Amino acid sequence: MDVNPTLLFLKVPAQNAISTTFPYTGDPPYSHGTGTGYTMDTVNRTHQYSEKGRWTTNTETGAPQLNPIDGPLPEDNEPSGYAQTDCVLEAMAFLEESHPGIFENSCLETMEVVQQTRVDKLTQGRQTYDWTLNRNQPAATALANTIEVFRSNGLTANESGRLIDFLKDVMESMDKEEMEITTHFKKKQRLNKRSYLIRALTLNTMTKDAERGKLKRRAIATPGMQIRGFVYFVETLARSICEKLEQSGLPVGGNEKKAKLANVVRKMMTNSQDTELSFTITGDNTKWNENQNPRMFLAMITYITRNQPEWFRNVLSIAPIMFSNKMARLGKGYMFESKSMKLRTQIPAEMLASIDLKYFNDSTRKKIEKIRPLLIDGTASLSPGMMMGMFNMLSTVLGVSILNLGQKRYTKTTYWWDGLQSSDDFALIVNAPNHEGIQAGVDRFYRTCKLLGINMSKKKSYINRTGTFEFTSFFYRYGFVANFSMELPSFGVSGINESADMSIGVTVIKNNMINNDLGPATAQMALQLFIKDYRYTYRCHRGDTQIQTRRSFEIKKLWEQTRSKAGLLVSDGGPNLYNIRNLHIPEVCLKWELMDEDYQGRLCNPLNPFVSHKEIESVNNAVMMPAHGPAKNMEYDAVATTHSWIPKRNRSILNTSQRGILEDEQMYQKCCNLFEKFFPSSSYRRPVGISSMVEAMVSRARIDARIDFESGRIKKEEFAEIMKICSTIEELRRQ
Amino acid sequence: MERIKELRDLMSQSRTREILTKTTVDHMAIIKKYTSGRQEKNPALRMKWMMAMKYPITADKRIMEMIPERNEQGQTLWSKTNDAGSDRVMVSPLAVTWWNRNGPTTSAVHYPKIYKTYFEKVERLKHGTFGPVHFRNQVKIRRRVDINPGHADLSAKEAQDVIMEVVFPNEVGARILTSESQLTITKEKKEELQDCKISPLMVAYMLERELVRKTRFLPVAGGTSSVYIEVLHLTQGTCWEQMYTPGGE
Amino acid sequence: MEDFVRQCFNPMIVELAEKAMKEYGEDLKIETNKFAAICTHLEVCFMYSDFHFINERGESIIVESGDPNALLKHRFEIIEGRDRTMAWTVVNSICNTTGAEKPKFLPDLYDYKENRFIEIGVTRREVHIYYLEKANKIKSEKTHIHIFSFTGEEMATKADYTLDEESRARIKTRLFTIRQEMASRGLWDSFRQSERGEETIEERFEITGTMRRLADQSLPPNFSSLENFRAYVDGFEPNGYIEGKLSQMSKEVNARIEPFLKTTPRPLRLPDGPPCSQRSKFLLMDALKLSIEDPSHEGEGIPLYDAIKCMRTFFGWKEPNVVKPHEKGINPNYLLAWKQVLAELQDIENEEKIPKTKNMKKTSQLKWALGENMAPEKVDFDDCKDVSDLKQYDSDEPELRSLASWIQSEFNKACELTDSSWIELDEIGEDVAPIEHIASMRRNYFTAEVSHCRATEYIMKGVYINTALLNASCAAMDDFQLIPMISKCRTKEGRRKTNLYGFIIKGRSHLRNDTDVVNFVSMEFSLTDPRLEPHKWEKYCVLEIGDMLLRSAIGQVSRPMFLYVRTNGTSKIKMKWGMEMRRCLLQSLQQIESMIEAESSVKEKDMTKEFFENKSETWPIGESPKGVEEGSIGKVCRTLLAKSVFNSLYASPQLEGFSAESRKLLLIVQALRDNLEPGTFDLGGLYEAIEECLINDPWVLLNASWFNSFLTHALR
Amino acid sequence: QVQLQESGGGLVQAGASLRLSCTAPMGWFRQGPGKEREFVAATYYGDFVKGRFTISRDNAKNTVYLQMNSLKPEDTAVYYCARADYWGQGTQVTV
RNA sequence: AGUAGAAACAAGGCC
RNA sequence: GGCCUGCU
C-alpha cells in the first residue's frame, strides 16, 4: 500500500482540511542577488501594456513618458492600461450619488489633519530612499539629512515644525538653480536643476524576499522623502473615504474582513428569491499595479476635492503629479563571473545605459535593449503606472466604485452584482434570473473593469454557486473555516528578547486559539514546543539537568541558591507553570508569589544596566512581519525585568566610508539624554517649540536650582554656582 | 549640579556645541531617531544566530563597575568594547543571570502597585471557579468588544493629560483637567506612586494602558463582558464551552 | 516708528521682543506699535525685577551692582521673556513648590516675601480702568496686580506696593522719558489705540514654477493645463458615457464561463528526464543506529564521548574501500577523510578528558571536500573587460528530472511505527480546569500515536543536526569542526538509549547574508546496498566500512555495512527553519484535532477516546493496486506528520508555487463534487501555471503524482 | 442630547405602502406585544423584511427613511428609529 | 565539486 | 605572520 495524503480530500471537504495544502513548515523562497532584472522586466511590461498610448518628452526632466489615457479601446482580453477619463469620472460621480456627502466630509477631516499635521509624523516609517546618499536609510535619518541639506541651501520654512511648510519648502526646492549635497569617501557637490528633479522623482528598487506562494520573485519600490508627505495626505484622504464604504476591506483587519464577507454573501443570497440564481467569482487581478495610471488618480482626487479650498486641492494633487513623472532606479546592478580566469565582478546598474551587451544573456540583452530608450541618468522613467501598491487605498476606492456601479440602479437589467474588493483581490456575488443573465452580468462587469485600467486574472479566477469561495487566504464554505497554517511561522521565538519572546509566544498561542480555532491539546503541544525551543535558543535550561552550555553554570548556582525554585523564570532556568488558563498572564506576575524576595529584588531592579527604554512608542510594541502579509506591530504584555535587554547592533558600519554617522549618532544621543534629564517628558510627549536646545536647558537650570533650593538639597553656594555656570555657558554660546 | 556640568562639558567641544545651538526643540524627535541601524526584517533568525556569539547583548557602561569582568571559572561577563552607535558596551548573557544571583537587591513591593493590570489579571484568575465542559456547536459571531477591563472611561488623549499631571506635573502646560473623575484619578495615582522609582516612562505607559479604553473586533459567543473577554481563549472553543466565573464576581 | 526701538532700547530687549514677535507668527512690518508697547512692558519688567536682591531675611537687599558673592538672589524672578512652554513650565513648578494656586493666564514675576505672582502691565490708558479690566479677565486671583500709566499714577489692590518707592520714581521717570521722547517723534495719532486684537490667516499652497509645468504634463492626452482640466472636471456631470463605450467596445472582450464537468479536468503532466535524486541533508530511510543504552537525556551529555562509546560498541571494522563513486568528485578524498575522522576520534579517546567540541586539521582532502578557496576573487570591472569568458552568472531554468519510485517508498516508511519513543516533551502547569484535563488526555493520545514514528525521529535528527551546525558556524567560523550525529530515544522496556548515525564536518562558515552557503561533509552508516537504486545517490560517495550481525532466525545474516559520504551545504535561513521542524507536529495534530472537534460538534460529546481505541471510522490515506485503502485516525496522524516533515525537508520555491496553483484546482474540483456548477474563465492558463512549478524536486513531483491519482479517483 | 422624531405610520391595508421618516449609523426597530423589540433595517436588513422594505437617508436635512412596500398583518407594531445611544418616541403602524 | 535556482554563495575590505 | 567586520 502506498500512502497518499491528498486522497484524504475524498472524505474531508477541501476547505475543512485546507491547512494540509500550506507548506509553511519549510524555508520560504529568498532572492540571492540583484533585483535589476526584475526591475527592468517590470518597467518594460508596464510600458508595453500601454504601447498604444502617445509619447511625449517632459520639458523639465527630459524623460520620455507614455500617456495611454483615453487611448484606443482594447480589442483583446490581454491586460490593458487604456483607462478612459470620462468613464472613471462617471464612476466616481455615481459613487458620490450612492453615498452623498462622502467626498465633502472626507475632504473636511483631511483638511483638518493636513493643517494640523507635524513634520515628525514622517519619522514613523520604514526604509526610505535618501537622495542625499542615493540609498535606502531609515525614515528618520533620511528626513534629517534632507532637512539639513534644505537648511544649508536656504530653505528653512520647515523650522515652523509643520508638514505643510516642509512640503512648501520641498516644492520651492524644485525651482532652484543649484543645490549642494555632502558626500564622504567630506566633499561638497553641486546638483543642477534637472539632476535634483530626477533625484527627487526617483524610486529605489529591491527584491522582495520571504514571499510564499509563487515560483518567481518580484520587485518592490521605495520612494524618497520629498514625496512621502503628499502620499501621507492622499492616503489619509483615501482611508477616510474607504472607512465610509462598506464594500472596501483594505483599511480593516482580518476578522472585520470575514464579517463583511459573510454579511455581503448573506445579503446577496438571502434577498435573491427562488427564481434568481446566484454565483460567486473568486477573482484576482493580473498586473494590478502596472495598469493603474497616476494621471487617473489625479483625476479621481480632483473630482473628490471639488468645491474645496484651492490650496487643499493643490496639496492633494501634488502627489499624483509627481508619480506621473516618477523615475525608478534600476537596482543594485549585475554580477559577472569568469571561470577561465576565475574571478567575479560587480557592475552597478547605472552602467546599463552605456555598457556593451556582450556580457548579458539573450533575455537580459533584450530587456536592456528595450528599456534603454527610457534610461535618463541611470534611472528609467515609469510614467505609465504604479510600481508597487503605493496608492493602495485609492486603488481600493476605484475597485469599490466598480463594485457599486452594479447596484441594479445603473445596470438597467435583471442581473446585478455586489461584493468586496481589497486591492489585487476581490469576491464578486452576481445574481440574475438565469444562467444567461449571470453570463451577461459577469461580461459587463469585466468590460467595465477593462475601461478603468483594471484587469481580471482569468487564470487565477473561477466562478461557482454562492456558498463556497475564497478571499485573501480566507476560505468560506457556508461559514469561514480556520486555517492555522498561515500563522504557523509565528509560533517560534520572535527574536526581540527573553521576556518579550516569552510574552509574544504565549500571546500568539492565545490569539490563534481565539481567532484561528486552535485546539486545546494543540495549544498545549505548541506551548511545550515553544518552551523547548525557547530554552534551547537562550541557553536557559531547567537547571536541574546536566546540559552543559555557556550559561549552565550561573543558572545552576542560582538554582541551588534559591529556596522556592518554583518561582524562577524560564529565562533563569526555572519550571514552566504556563497552561491554557495562564496564556494571558505575563511570566513575572504568574511567578511573583513564588519568587524569593532576594531573587525578586535582583530581577526587577530599576538600576539594572540592561533595561533601556527610548520612547512611549517602543515600550511594549514588537514589529513582526507576518507571513503572507504586510509588516504588522503587536502589543505584548511584559514586565520590565533584567531580561528586557536589547540585542547587539550590526556593527558593520565601521568598515564603510559612512563611518562618521556613528559619531553623529553618539553625539545626538548624548544631547538627547541630556535634554531628557532636563525635560523628563521628552520621551512620552515629544517637545514642541521654536527655541534652541541650550536656551531651554540653561533657563530650566536657572529655575530648577532656584526652586529646589526654596525646598530641597541645593544650597546658596550651589545655587549661585549653578547661576554663574549658566552665565558661563551663555557666554560660551556667544563665542 | 551634575546635569548642567555635563551640559557645559558638551558645549566645550565644538561639534556638540553646534548641535546644541543650531538644533531647535521641535527637531528633538528627529535627531533622537536619527540612526544607521535598520529595523530587522527577520528577528528570529538573528536572535538564534547572535545568541551563539560571546557578548551578544548590550548594557549601559555602569555594568563595568557593578559586575566583575569574569565569574568564578573565568567566563567573561562583559566587554569594554562599545556598541556601534552608542556608549553602551556589549556583554554576555551570563551577566544577566549573575545579576539575578549576586547583583544588588532592592524592595520590589511597589511593582504590584505599578503593574496594576497584570496583577489584577492574576488575582482575578486565582479566585476563579471552573465548571463542566459542554460539547455543542458554538455559533461564533464577530463583534466589537473592549479588551481592557480596567479602562476608566477615558480615551488616549483624554487620559494623556491625566498621566502627565500624575507623572510630569510641570510639563502639563495650559491644560488643567476639568472633569472631576480625572481629579480623583490624579489624586489617587499621585499619592499611590509618590516615591516609586521604576521609571517615569514605564509608569506613564502603564497608566495609559490601565486608564485608556481600547477596543478590538473578535469572534465571540456569549460573554461580551470585559472580564469574560480576557479569558475568551479558555471559555469558548470550536465545539466546547467551559463555564467560568472570574474572581471579581 | 521702528527707528525708536533702533535708537533707545538695548539689544537684549530688542531681540527678546523679536523672538516674542516670531512666537505667535505675525509679521513686524504690518503693525509695529505692538512691538514697542510690549518691549516697554518687558523693559519695565526687567527694571522692576533687577537691582532687587534678597538675603536669608526678608527685607530685600537693594544694590545698584551685584557684588561678587553667593548673595546674588533676585527679589523678583521674571516669568515673561520666555516661550509659552517655558512660561507654563515656571508657572507649574512654582505652583508645585510654593503650594500656591495656578493662574490661568501668564504672570510676569514671582516674589518670596509675599510668595506670589505679579502681572505688570503699563497701558496707554489710565490705570483705574485697565486694572479692573485685567482683573475681570483673571478669575478669582490672589496674585497681586500692579499697573502704571503714562500720566505718572500708580495703583493697586490692598493699597499694596511691594518694594521701595525710589524704584517706582525710577519707573515713572522712565515712563515720562518715553512719553516726551515720542513728543519729539509724534506717534500719538495711533499710539493710544493701535492694537485691536486681530487674529486671522489664510493658508496658501500655490503650485508655481517647475512644479506647475509638471502638472501640465500629467493630464489626459487632449488637455493643455491643470486649470483647464480642473474646470472640465468641475463642469463634468454623468451623461451615460460608460454605456456608449461599452456599446462601442469590441465584443471579443468577454469573460465567457466555460462549464467545469467531470470530463473537463485532465491529469497534470509531469516532466521527463533523468530520474530524480536525493536532496536531504541526512539519510532518512537507510539510517543505521549505534547505541549504548545510557540513562542520559536528549541534551544531557557530551557529544564526542557518546559518539566514541557508541562506535566502540560495534565490532567488525574493515579497511574502507570504494563501492559506489561520487561520479563527479574525487572519492579517494572521501576515503582519506573517513580514515582521518577515525584517527582523530582515537586521538581524542587517548587524552585526558574528551573535549566538548573538536576542531579538525585542514588537509587538502577536506579543503576539496568543503570547497575552500574556490570562490572567484572579487575584482573591478575596469580591470577585467577584455576577458572573452567574462559573462553573467548562469541563470536558467533548472534541469528537468522525472519522478522515481524511491520517494514514494521513503514516504511510505516515514509513516511507519517504530520500537522507540522519539519525543520527550517538556513540563506544563498542572491542569486545573476540566477542559485542561480533556486537552491533556487528547495530547497524551496523540503523543502515544506519533512518538513511535519515523517522522518524529527525522524531526529530532534534523533539529539536532541543524542546531549543532548553526552553533558551530557562529562560534568556530574559521576552523573545520567535527559533530557526531546524535539522537536519544527510549525503548519499550523504558531504558533510555543513545544513537549515533554518523558525523558531520562543518567548514568555513563566514555567513553574512541569509543566503550565504556553509558547506559541510556528511558521513552516515547504513546497510542499504547502493547498487540497487543508483540514480537516487547521484551526489553521494558510498564506501564499504564493515560487517554487521543482527540476530535472525536464518543463522545470522552478517550483512555488509556501508558508509554514505557526501558534500552538502546549507544556509542561515535553512538552518533556522530546519531547527524549527517541531511545528510539523503542530500542523499535523492541529489538523487531526480540528477533525475531532468538527465531528464532536455533531454528537454533543467528546469523541477522542472512541476514535483512538475503537478505530471504526477510517479515512482514505492511500491507494493499493486493489483500490483505495483507509486507515484509522492514528495512521492519518502519522501520514500528515510525515507530509509536514517532508515539506520542511524538501522545501523549495517549486513546492510553494505548486501548492498554491494546485490548491486552486483542488478548490475547483471540490466545488464540482459539491454540485455547485463551477466554472472557469481560462483553465488552460491555470494548468500551465501548475505545470511550470514541476521541474526537478522529488517532493513536488510526488505531490503532483498524488494530485493526479486523486483526480482519477475523484470525478466519479 | 440629540433627539429623534419619527413621522409616518397610520392605518394601512394588507398589501399597501407606507413611508416612515426619522428627523433629528441609523436604524429602524419595531415592537409589538407578545414578543420583543425586532431589528428591521440599518444598508443592512434582517431576513424577514428583505426586498419589501428600503431604508434610505438624506444627510442634507437630517432625515432617514423607511419605505415599506407589500405590507402584511404581522407588520403591525410601533416603529422606532435609533442612532449610535439614542432612540425616538415612536409611531404605530397598523396593517 | 557542492548548495541553489532566472542570481548568487563557495568570506569581505583595509594595509 | 600581526590586527578589523559579520543585516550597512
Residue numbers in the entry:
A (entry chain B): 1 to 185, 207 to 756
B (entry chain C): 1 to 249
C (entry chain A): 1 to 716
D (entry chain F): 1 to 24, 33 to 50, 58 to 99, 116 to 126
Task: Show sentences the authors wrote.
PB1 houses the polymerase active site, whereas PB2 and PA contain, respectively, cap-binding and endonuclease domains required for transcription initiation by cap-snatching. High-resolution structures of the complete viral polymerase from a number of human, avian and bat influenza A viruses, as well as influenza B, C, and D viruses have been determined. These structures have revealed that the polymerase is a highly flexible macromolecule that can assume a variety of distinct conformations, enabling the polymerase to perform both transcription and replication that require different initiation and termination mechanisms.
β-globin mRNA was added to the vRNPs to facilitate primer-dependent transcription, in the presence of an excess of purified nanobody. These assays showed that a subset of nanobodies significantly inhibit transcription and/or vRNA to cRNA replication with Nb8207 being particularly potent. Nb8190, Nb8191, Nb8192, and Nb8207 caused a significant reduction in viral titre at most time points tested. Binding of a nanobody at this site inhibits RNA production in both transcription and replication without affecting other polymerase activities such as CTD binding. We speculate that nanobody binding could inhibit RNA exit by blocking the product exit channel or might prevent the polymerase from assuming an active conformation as binding of a nanobody at this site is incompatible with the packing of the C-terminal domains of PB2 in both transcriptase and replicase conformations.
